[PDB]
């Protein structure tokens, strides 16, 4: 019975990833004064099916100079970590109701970097090494500020449980008292997933393709669905953190519709940002978070740890 | 004869200058809006957190009443 629950969790997110490829292509085309795919089917509904069937009947092309074991393990680890880290999200009831879901998602987001790193190192190429080291630089740029942002915004919730975050935002949204943390969190989620303007790993300008330049079709699709499932999970995580919707225990479909449309708007905002900005340099991103975001994050952390004591508004931990 | 020529009065005006309309508010307005939003959020959070503390105290004293039988 739990098998039914986990398969009904993991199949619609793959379908969502494919239709996210469709929506990304069509919306990005329409923002560039042109049209997206509409010839494959009725309004292009069959383009992701054609892409998926095409990519799984092509040659795998395992290189000779690459360590084959890590070359196979890295996309498997990427897709796996993209799968078993959707679980603690309350929709409105999570599949796994972890007591420490926030730290779990932090740890498994730290673990997903190793797939990119071992993909870059395993395939014996210089561009893959450059992409892997740029991923390392991006991780050391963003991780500490991301964790302090989460700690400062969880001081009003009471605990690390993601299920109690709806109860915290039952009266008002959490973006009203923590909007600078919300903006910094949005930039951190943009830089976490290597999305534009902080791509810097699959750079088609400075490099050819980066870490996945030696990965032909079949294994290359795994990184694509891992990245797109990652951006959907960041959108849902940001929606739960800062845009908590009204929850009725008798009608969970209201909360499901509400956070579904909010996460869709957040993904639309992601693609809106993608089409409009030039790519950051990966040394400028390093000085962005470590010099501008970090002092403000420390000041806001001290403000948010001295605020509930000041106002007799310390939230319960139960 | 018939050739491609401009008319007697010439053509209309053609622009060649940079046009940036400078749309938006001053810094004081947006900073005051942000401060007001922060104050409203802080007040709502203080009220809801006090209510949640009272509810937690009620649940704890319910457990206190239920303890000896268990
Ligand atoms: C989740 C909700 C929605 C969030 C926003 C999402 C939609 C909008 C997205 C916009 C596009 C973003 C694209 C990526 C941009 C990347 C660059 C970037 O972000 O750079 C950050 C830039 C960095 O600046 P920089 O890169 O220009 O560096 C300047 C460097 N020097 C100075 C040396 C030249 O700005 C910040 O770091 C600001 C962070 C947020 C600040 C919030 C302040 C709130 C108010 C505080 C109080 C102020 C009053 C005074 C005190 C009063 C006390 C009572």
Swiss-Prot record, chain A:
Task: State the superkingdom.
Answer: Eukaryota
Q: Which GO terms describe its cellular component?
A: mitochondrial inner membrane; respiratory chain complex I
Spans traversing the lipid bilayer: 2-22, 68-88, 100-120, 147-167, 172-192, 217-237, 253-273, 294-314
Disulfide feature:
none
The molecular function terms in GO held by this entry are:
NADH dehydrogenase (ubiquinone) activity
Membrane topology of this protein: Multi-pass membrane protein
The entry assigns this protein to a family as follows: Belongs to the complex I subunit 1 family.
Q: What name does the UniProt record give this protein?
A: NADH-ubiquinone oxidoreductase chain 1
| High-level lineage | Eukaryota, Metazoa, Chordata, Craniata, Vertebrata
